[PDB]
Amino acid sequence: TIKALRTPEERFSVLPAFPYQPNYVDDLGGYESLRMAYIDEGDKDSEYTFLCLHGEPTWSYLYRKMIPVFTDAGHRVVAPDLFGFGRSDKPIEDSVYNFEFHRNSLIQLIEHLDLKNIVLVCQDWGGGLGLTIPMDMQDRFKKLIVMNTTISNGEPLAEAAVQWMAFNETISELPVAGLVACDAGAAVNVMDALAYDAPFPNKNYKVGVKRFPQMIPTNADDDAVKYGLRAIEFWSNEWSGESFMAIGMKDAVLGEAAMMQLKTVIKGCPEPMKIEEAGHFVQEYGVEVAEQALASFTM
Template sequence: MIEALRTPDERFDTLPGYGFKPHYLTQANGLRMHYLDEGKHAGKTFLCLHGQPTWSYLYRRMIPIFTAAGHRVVAPDLFGFGKSDKPREDSVYSFDFHRDSLIALIRALDLHNVVLVVQDWGGLLGLTIPMKMPERFTGLLVMNTALGTGDVPLTQGFLDWRAWNNKNPDMAIAKLMQRSCPHLSAEEAAAYEAPYPDKDYKGGVRRFPNLVPDAPDAPGAATSQRARDFWKKDWTGTTMMAIGMTDPVLGPPVMQALAKIIKGCPPPLELPEAGHFVQEWGERVATEALARF
């Protein structure tokens, strides 16, 4: 079994805007994954995947809009994030470890008529899943993210972020979120830090920048290359793209390149004031997504 930490529940008791009921799935590796499961099961299922260093709290502005329209929202916390278990050893966290855990959740909940909602690592991982089970997915809402194919040079913005991340293993997450999203209250910014009592809980957060495939033979690259082919040739669902235009790492140039890969991708919704964490400007995104889907 994998040795893991579990954040005390009381750290989540008074988070602003996050009055959702927790759900848990214990996977074959013995780790417990937390996920939100809101709304009715009669409509579409919006599967909302977060990235680094966030967790399902990121979707609190969008979830009520989707559920009010009669849809279901499932928003998991990746292992190492949020209310999910956090393996102690950084080496546990790998591209396939995270991807396999998401596939296991989709199968365990038997999700169908899924609109895949992704941003940051939610996309690097999530965009590789529909090719494995295309019958489950009917839509894609894609925000600032990319495919880690390993055969496209990494941007200088990302290389700078990775270097900074490696120099700061005890990342000050609340401060980072408030710099990226100046409209957050102090309490909202602190909520992003809630899952991590100390740096021992941040292994998953630390690992992600070093998991981005940076060569064609890097772990995850071949899977991402196959996914690129899927989105180019085989995708038949409805797509919406929203771009936080002030993102220095996964902003307009990266997203414009991704749009060319996704078959049938319409012109994106551009959010001039939004940065990397597009969901923090998510009310407009969710409302326009409902009209699209």
């Protein structure tokens, strides 16, 4: 009963670099009839499942270069499109989108597919949300691949983050393909730009895109920080898995400085892979990340 738009299917008819048939779930508890799209590739009896979480303003298409590396190695991959993104349904009311709304959708998806032996792969809000999940499902998660992201700790926001919020407030709507192409350079072509704009025929479809910047916590009393501080405890003290970090250096907000701070709270995190040519959207340079992660790991 949540008012939402479904992106017309013709928007997805030209996706040559992402040739997976999407799967759908529309009975997640609390979200009844809101349909979540997700990629599911590799053998269901694979030992390990790579759960690949996107953020703002992307979808599972972002993971198109990483997915084949994981499936070539004999693993399963699950890459959902968050509500408001990709091929998932898109609520049209501002207030529906929040930290809890997104986090719980992922928790429900995980329990719906009964995912186990999970390698969490995350970036941006993918990590902001996703890194807060294993603490409440410890037996499901075994390893972590982390890219440009952060866990909210409630500290005053850096100028770059504040500027980002004010930008998204002032503009008519965010140019989604524009933003990604500006970040990724030669790693994104016009076919990719088409794919990134595909979910959003107009601004009525971009309420989730509008809401993510507004959701960045400005005080310690936000859900993002409440969950965040518990997660930091989990990765520092409870976590006993293997991790791998890849940093896109051309990121003024969640680049090297923010990632190294994050590394300090992930117990066992080895030396990060630092990709000088990569921006915030690390997965556009993600073949070598997926290869090196796998080589580093004991599968």
